[PDB]
Amino acid sequence: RSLKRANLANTSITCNDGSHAGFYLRKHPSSKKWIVLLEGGWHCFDVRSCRSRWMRLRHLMTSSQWPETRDVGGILSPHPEENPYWHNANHVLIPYCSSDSWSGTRTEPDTSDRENSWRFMGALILRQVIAELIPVGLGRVPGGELMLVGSSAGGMGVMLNLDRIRDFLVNEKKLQITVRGVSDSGWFLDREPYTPAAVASNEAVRQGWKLWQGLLPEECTKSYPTEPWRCYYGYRLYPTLKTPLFVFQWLFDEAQMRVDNVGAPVTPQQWNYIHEMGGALRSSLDNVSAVFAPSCIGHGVLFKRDWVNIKIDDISLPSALRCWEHSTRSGLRLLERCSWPQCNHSCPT
Amino acid sequence: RSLKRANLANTSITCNDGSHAGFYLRKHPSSKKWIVLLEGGWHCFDVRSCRSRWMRLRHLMTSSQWPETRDVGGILSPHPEENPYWHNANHVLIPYCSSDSWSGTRTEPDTSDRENSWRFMGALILRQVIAELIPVGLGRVPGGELMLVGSSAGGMGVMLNLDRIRDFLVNEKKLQITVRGVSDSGWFLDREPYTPAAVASNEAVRQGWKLWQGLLPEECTKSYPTEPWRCYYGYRLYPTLKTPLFVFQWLFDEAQMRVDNVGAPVTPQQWNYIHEMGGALRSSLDNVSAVFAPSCIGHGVLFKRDWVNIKIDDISLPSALRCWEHSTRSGNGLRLLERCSWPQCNHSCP
Ligand SMILES: *[C@@H]1O[C@H](CO)[C@@H](O)[C@H](O)[C@H]1NC(C)=O
Ligand SMILES: *[C@@H]1O[C@H](CO)[C@@H](O)[C@H](O)[C@H]1NC(C)=O
């Protein structure tokens, strides 16, 4: 049966347009394990991008179109064939309606522009959802677990908020619970674009950070006192992250191709750029302890039925995630050993 | 379909009585992975014990009672529910008919006594089976794998022979194959018994070594040149073992209780001895990289249907073995020892 819509008790926590935020829940009768998944879908960082987003992707800026139930595959599927190790866990979906990579703390619209009217509350939404799971069972029985997982902007969202959420549950609330995070397709790089963009990658990030009042991890901003927004990049944040984080990243990630302004690749120049992009991604993952990085073009995987089919060295993604789970109960570096696009026989399409 | 009996091409490789050795096979049409399971069943170490074994356990000294097929559960089951990760591998069973912990090389009876007719060829049987799997497909396609696994005396057999077999396949034959070992209930301790035994452990061990002409790994025997038979103990051999080895051991192992001469426990004194034996086993596993050691009374696990049900920290044995397999895929770990210390404190004990 489906994930059912739920409300937040604090009605001041809202989506971009002021509609109330919320989540979807499928409670399991006896599990003490919880999978909380953050949806993604880019972001907006100024008046023009946010107007375009409202016109083209309205459902990401409001809860007014949310249905009463949702069905999500992959790691939130209740079917053992599709979700071999977490089918019988408590499942939570948090829709993305804040356009701020789950970092925003801006309760009222920016004073700078009285014409920029959007609320950016992503960080406060996540914190409120985790708070509302507690009276519904999260951490109630000692020995329980929380895996906080996210795709795309949700993957960033996990990285940004993981240590805070862990500290809230374990230190503030005194729960006897193991917390871990998974970032799927949220590991982005700032690098020279294929051709010059309308605005520098880093310039959009800085503007967003200001507009959203982005809440960034304290340990990471200490390393970047003059440019704290560098902490939106996973490879910059990772060295000071204390809580276990599994990283899934397609080596030829389609969102990174859009960031790098490659275009739909139809020339050898574009393809060579993509080949090199893959190598840069691979290098950027050098210090990650638990990584699953196939040589395929894609974006997102954790909500997809075919997540069970992607394999590296004949090890499936759910199998790798399960082995990471075992090893962090108090990891595997699976990066493709061939370097070129679609050299993995199990690539989806 | 069952595991089907196969013969060896070399007819000098025999069971204790001189009957021909062999193995059972279930070839999978596609897989490049092989599970090779060594059966156990104690050993005999002198004339008297071998005579008793012939009379009480004859099937362990001969192939004359072997059936044409065998069905073995656990890691050799072809059913996914029973064997979630290896149901679709090639499977091989090597029956135990040499009574020498898979270590013997005595090809000809000790001529000094004509009523001692026994051949002890366990190390030679294993080597030959492996050699004979090559034309059948072992390591034929690059990228394949061998998991050499063993219970009881077979667990010891794996530990004794693993580096040799890996060297044979990878170096001698140049196969592009990843080799790993598993010892189930093969990790024994020489400790003071609950009450003194008629024969003392290290005495039996030394006698068996001589009688079997036991073949021991060189890197271990260097450390014990005066007493190479010390290398029959897992904790002594482990430090110099190069190949990945997963150790399953029940912390209240029944064979250890038999060697320690506790008797069927019906008194607090016996139970307190058993409790401390578990503590000693636990402690002997201190340096082992990949271990699954539940607080349960038992002996053997890999051939059992219920192997899927034993859990430590909610991690099943097959799931731990699979994670070790992933983590050792380059030929280089989860230490799951029970967190409570007392007999049957695990809710999943069989
Ligand atoms: C509700 O949320 C708003 C915005 O985060 C916060 O300012 C306020 O303190 C919260 N109210 C309560 C009662 O927690
Ligand atoms: C067969 O094995 C026997 C006993 O180990 C050995 O002596 C002999 O050389 C072997 N014969 C072969 C390989 O032809």
From Swiss-Prot, chain B:
The keyword Glycoprotein applies. One of its GO terms (biological process) is protein depalmitoleylation. Keywords: Glycoprotein, Hydrolase, Secreted, Serine esterase, Signal, Wnt signaling pathway. GO terms for cellular component: cell surface; extracellular space. Induction: Expression is induced by Wnt. It is found in: Secreted; Cell surface. Its main location: secreted. It is an enzyme of class 3 (hydrolase). Glycans are attached at N10, N287, N346. Its EC number is 3.1.1.98. Changing S152A: Impaired ability to inhibit the Wnt signaling pathway. The keyword Hydrolase applies. It catalyses: [Wnt protein]-O-(9Z)-hexadecenoyl-L-serine + H2O = [Wnt protein]-L-serine + (9Z)-hexadecenoate + H(+). The active site is at S152, D253, H299. It comes from the Eukaryota. Coiled coil: none annotated. Carboxylesterase that acts as a key negative regulator of the Wnt signaling pathway by specifically mediating depalmitoleoylation of WNT proteins. Serine palmitoleoylation of WNT proteins is required for efficient binding to frizzled receptors. Also acts as a regulator of long-range activity of Hedgehog (hh), possibly by regulating the switch between low and high level hh pathway signaling. Belongs to the pectinacetylesterase family. Notum subfamily. This is Palmitoleoyl-protein carboxylesterase NOTUM. It comes from Drosophila melanogaster (Fruit fly). The chain holds residues 86 to 616 of 671 of the full protein.
